[PDB]
Amino acid sequence: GPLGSMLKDVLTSELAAQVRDAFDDDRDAETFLLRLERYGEDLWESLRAVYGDQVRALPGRLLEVMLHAYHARPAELRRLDEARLLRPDWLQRPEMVGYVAYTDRFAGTLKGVEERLDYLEGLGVKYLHLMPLLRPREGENDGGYAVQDYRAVRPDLGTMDDLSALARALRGRGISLVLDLVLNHVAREHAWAQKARAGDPKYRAYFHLFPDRRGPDAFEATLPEIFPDFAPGNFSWDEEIGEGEGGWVWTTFNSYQWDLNWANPDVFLEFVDIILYLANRGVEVFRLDAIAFIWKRLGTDCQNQPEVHHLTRALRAAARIVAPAVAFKAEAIVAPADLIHYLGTRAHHGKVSDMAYHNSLMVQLWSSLASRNTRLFEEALRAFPPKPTSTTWGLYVRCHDDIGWAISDEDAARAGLNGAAHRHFLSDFYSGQFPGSFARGLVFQYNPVNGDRRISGSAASLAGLEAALETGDPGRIEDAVRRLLLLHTVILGFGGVPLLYMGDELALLNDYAFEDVPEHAPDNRWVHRPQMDWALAERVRQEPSSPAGRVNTGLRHLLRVRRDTPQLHASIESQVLPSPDSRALLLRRDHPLGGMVQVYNFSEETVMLPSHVLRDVLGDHVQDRLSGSAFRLDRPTVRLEGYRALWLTAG
Amino acid sequence: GPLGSMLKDVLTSELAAQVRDAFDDDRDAETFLLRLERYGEDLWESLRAVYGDQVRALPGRLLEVMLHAYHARPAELRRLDEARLLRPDWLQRPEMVGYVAYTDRFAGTLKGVEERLDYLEGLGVKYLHLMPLLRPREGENDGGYAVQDYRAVRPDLGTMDDLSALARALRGRGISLVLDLVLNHVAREHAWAQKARAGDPKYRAYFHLFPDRRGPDAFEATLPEIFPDFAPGNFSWDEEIGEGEGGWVWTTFNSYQWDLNWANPDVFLEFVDIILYLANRGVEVFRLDAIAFIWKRLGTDCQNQPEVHHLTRALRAAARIVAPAVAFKAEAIVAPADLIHYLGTRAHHGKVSDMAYHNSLMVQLWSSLASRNTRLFEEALRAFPPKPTSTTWGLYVRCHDDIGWAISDEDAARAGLNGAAHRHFLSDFYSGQFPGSFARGLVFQYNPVNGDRRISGSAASLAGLEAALETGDPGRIEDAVRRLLLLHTVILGFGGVPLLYMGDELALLNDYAFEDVPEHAPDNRWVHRPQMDWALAERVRQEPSSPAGRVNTGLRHLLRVRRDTPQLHASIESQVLPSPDSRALLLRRDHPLGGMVQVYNFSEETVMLPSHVLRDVLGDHVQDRLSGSAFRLDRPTVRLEGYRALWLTAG
C-alpha cells in the first residue's frame, strides 16, 4: 500500500543517486542505470528471498563493488560486452565447440597455452575451460578445487597478468576463456578459514561451525556421503577451532574443503567481488562448481534448496550489470525437472544461468553403449521439461570427474528395467567385472553402507580401446574406435556446446602412473586426468591410420559437419522419435529449413531399421550430412552397420 | 583466392576508416564499428545478392546516410536502443498487447492520441500501430496507402514534432509506436513521380515505365489482379509520361499507386533514409506494407521473389546498426513454408524480420466459426515449419483490409475437403448468402474471370451481432458475444502479439455510412473502418451487461489472464493436439513450468469431449486459467458448452 510503496520509491531513488554520483561521464551513468533497470528487480527480489530485510542494508555495499568494477573494466572488455549484447545467441551457434584442460597438463603454464592456440583453432575450438588455476592449498588439493587464494594464479602457471594476456590472445582467435567459480567451499588454509580459527567472529561466520556432535549428528541424519573413502560424513574435527579444544566444521567434500556459509550476505559480497575481478581479467563464462550444495537446511539433503536459484540469479545479475559478456554454467546433478530450474523457468523471474551440463545425456550414452539397448535412453530424455530457448546445454562424453549412474527408478521402470539393478550392472560392466565387458574403468567411492559405486576411467579405456589393444584383435580395435566416434557424434549433434575433454581427440587411455604420485594415489580420478601427449598428437597428424589417428580424423570431420549444419542451433531441442528396434536411437530436430533425424546404432550388430519411421518424418529421399551419401526411404529397410550414425535431412 | 581476398580487405578497411573519421568521440566510433561487425556481412552480402557489383559503389553512400542518422539520433532513443539490446525478447512477453487505429478515427489528431493514453494503458496496450499518417495524395488515397510525402505528417493530424512528442508520451507508458513503411509504391503525386513525368531520367528510373503494350502484356500473362473493380490489371496509362503521348506505368494496386523500381539501388537508399528519419522521431516497429511485391521478374507472379528477403534483411541491418531498438514486421500473404522466410531461416544468414502477421490463423478462425469444424484448422497449422525462436507472430481477428480465403488445396484435402469448394462456401457464408448464416459481410473485389471473392465487414458484424440485434433474439445475441470472445481468446493464447483492432473491444458493427462519402463509397473496406464511439466506450464502462459491455468485460478479463500466464511466451509455439471431436480445437504449449492445453469449442453445441486426450498430456487434475475452476480428467468426459474456451494446466 502507500506506506510500502513510499519506502520502495525512496530506495529506488537512493540507488539512482549513488549511480549518478559515481560517474563524471553521463553516458556511463545512464548505461549503468539502464542495466540496473533491466536486472535490478531480479537482483533485489532474489536477495530479499534469501536474506529478508537484511538486504535493505545491502544495496549500498553491493553497488560500491559493482560501480568500482564498472570503472575498472578495460575498454576492450566493455567492447566485448557490447558485442555479446549484439549477438545474444552466441553460445547456441553450431560453430561453438568447447575444449576442457588443466593448464599444466595441456601446456605447462598460461604462456604455454598461448603457444598452442593454432592447435585449438585448428580443432575449431571457440570455448576453452581451463581447470581450477587459482592458488590452491599445498599438497593434496582435490585437483585445484581446494582454493587458498581467489585473487592469485597458482604460481607455477603464471600470474594474473598472464591470465589476462592469455584471454586477449584467445579473443584474437574467437575463443572464450571459461573458469571455475569454486563458490561452495574454500581450502582450510584460505585466510577466511585461518582467521575463523584464530577467533575472528566476522570470519567464523563465513563457515558452519559446531562446538560438539549435536549439530553434526542432527544434519548427518539426512545427508548423503560424497567421499566416504576420503572424508567420512560431512563434518570434520579441527583442533584449532575455538580457544579450547577444537570444534566441528561442515566439510561436504574433503576434510580440507570448508563449506562456506551462504546464509551470511558477506559471503555473497565476497563472491560478487571475485566474479567481477576475474571478469575484468577476461573471464567470459563461470562454471558454478557444486552450486546445488550452497544452501544448508536441517532435515534435508542440503542440495538444490530454493535459495540456490535465488543466489545464482543475484550473482548473475550483479555480474552482468557490470559485464554483460559474462555467462554462467551450472554444474548440478539432480533430477531433470529440477535441472531446468538451474537454467530458468520462462516466468515472472529472470534467467538463473546461461548453460548447464547435461549429465543425463552423458550417463545414457555410456549406459546404452553397455546394454546395447536404447529404450532407457528414450525414457530418460522424454522426462525432461523443455528449457528456456535462450539457454544452452553443455554436453560431454567425459570430464575430470568420475561417472555417477544418475538413472531414475521411474525412467528405468518405463523401459522395463529395475533402476537399482541397472545401476549395479553399469558399475560391474564399466569396472570390467562383467564377463565379456570391453571396459577398463576403476571403481570410485564404493559405499559399503548402501552399495553405491561410481567409475573412473578415460573415454578410450571405458569404450574398449585399452582392452582391444592388449588383445591385438582388429575387430575389437575397430569396434572401440567406432564406439568413441559414435559417443562424440551424439554430443556434437544433440544441440548445445560439446565440451571435448583434453586428449579424447587422441583416444588417451587410463594413466595408471597416478599411483606413483603420493598426492594423487588415493584418488583414482587421476587415472583419467593424463598429461597431454604432444608426440602422439604429431604422430596422428602424420599417420592418421592408427586407432588414435582414426578417432582424430573422424572427430575432426564430425566437427566440420557440425559447424555447417544449421539444424544444430541450440535454441531448438532434440526430441525422441520412438525407435522400432531397441538397438537404435532416433532423435528428431525441427528447423525452419527442414527437419533432421539423427540415427544411432548403439550395437556392434548390423541393424536393418524399418524405413517407415524415418519416411514419415522426412519423406522418400534423404541425404546423410555425415557421409554425403543418399537413401530412398520407400524401401523396406535402412541398413545400419555396427555403430553407424546418420544425420538425415530431406533431399 | 589472394586477389579476391585482397580486394575484400581493402574494402573492409575503407569502411572502417570512414566510420572512425566520422566520430570525434571514440566510444561512438567503436560502438558503430561493433554494430557494423555484427550486421555488416548480412548487409553487404544481401546487397550483392540483389545488386551484384553495383553494390561496390554503394557502401560509401549508404554509410553517409547511416553515420549522419547515428549523429542525429536523440540521446533518449540511443537509451531506448540499449534498453532493447538488454531485453531482446521484449516482443515475446505475455504482457505484450497491440492496438491498431487510424489516428483521426480514434482521436482526431496526434495530440488527441495523447489525451487517450489512459484508455490504451487501461487495456494493457504496450504496442500501438497508427495507420498511414504520412502526407497522402488529396481525395481517394487508399486510406493513406498512396503516400505523397514520407517526410511530412498529414497536416490535419499534426506535424513531425507532434509525432515525436506522441512517441515520447507513449514510451512514458511502456507503449511502442508502430507505423507502416509503404515501400512498394508511392502516390502518382509524390515528387519522384512528378519528376519522372517531367522527364528527369534519375526519377523515371524509380518506376517501371513502358512506351506501349509490349512489356505490360508480357507481364500480365503471369500476374494476378489485386483490385479488378478499382484498377484492372497491373498497368495504367498516363498521358503525361514521356514527351509525346504518355506511356504505361506498373500499378499493382490502384492506378494512383506507382510501383517503385527496387532493381535501382537509389530506391534502396531513399528507404534507408526514410526508415532512419522516422526511427529518429520515435518509431519502434515498421510494418513492411506489400513487402512480397517489391521485386518484379518476367514470367512470375512478381510476389515473394528471393530478392525480397535480401532487400528486407539489408534494410533491417542498415536500420539497426544505427538504431538497435527498431524491429520490422512483415505483411505477406503466402504459403506457410514461404512465410517463414519473411522471419528467418536459422542458418548462415541473418534474421529477415522480427515479426510477421499470422494470416493463416485469422483465416482458420473465421473458417471454423462458419463450418463448426476444426479439422481444416488442424491441418493448416500442421503445415507450418517452426519459426526462429527469437521471432514473433502478430495475431489478429480483424484489421483494415478485407479477408482473403488463403486456404491451400493440400491442407483442405488432408481434412477431407475440396479447397475451391470450401473457399466458395466461406464467401457465400460471410456475405450472408448461405441460408441460416449469422454473418453480415460484404463481397469485395468479385473477379468474374475466376470467381475469386474477398469479404469486408467488422468482427462483430461477421460474428453474428449485427444480425442478432436486428432479430432481438437473446440466444442469437448470446452466441454472437460468445463467438467474439472465443476469437479473441485464441489470438490472446496462441503465442505472439495480439493486434486488437480499434473498436472490436466495443463490438462495433459495420458502418454503412461509408457509402455517403464519395472518396470511400467505391471501396466497401471502409465498412469496417469506423470512427471510434467514445459515448459507447463510456456506456460499457458504466453498464457492462449490454452485448457490447459483455464483449468489453470478457476481453479485459482475457487480457489480464494473458499477462499472467507465463506459458504464453512467444519463443514457444502452439502445437496441434489432434482432437477426437471435429467441433473442438486443442492446442498444446510446452513450457519449463509445465505444459498447457488450450481447448476451444467452435460450435454452439454442447461438446462432451473425451477426457483421455487431455489427461494424457496433463495428468488427472487440472485448472482452467480462464475461469479459475478445476477438472478431474479421470472422468469419461469434459463438458464444453457452446463456444467454451479452457486454458488448462496441471494442478
Short mmCIF file of C-alpha atoms in Angstrom, two decimals, chain B residues 87 272 277 293 406 411 455:
data_model
loop_
_atom_site.label_atom_id
_atom_site.label_comp_id
_atom_site.label_asym_id
_atom_site.label_seq_id
_atom_site.Cartn_x
_atom_site.Cartn_y
_atom_site.Cartn_z
CA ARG B 87 15.77 -7.16 -23.35
CA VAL B 272 17.05 3.56 -45.71
CA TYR B 277 14.38 9.55 -40.24
CA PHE B 293 5.55 -7.29 -54.14
CA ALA B 406 -5.99 -18.20 -48.20
CA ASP B 411 -4.46 -28.56 -46.40
CA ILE B 455 -15.07 -10.22 -47.66
#
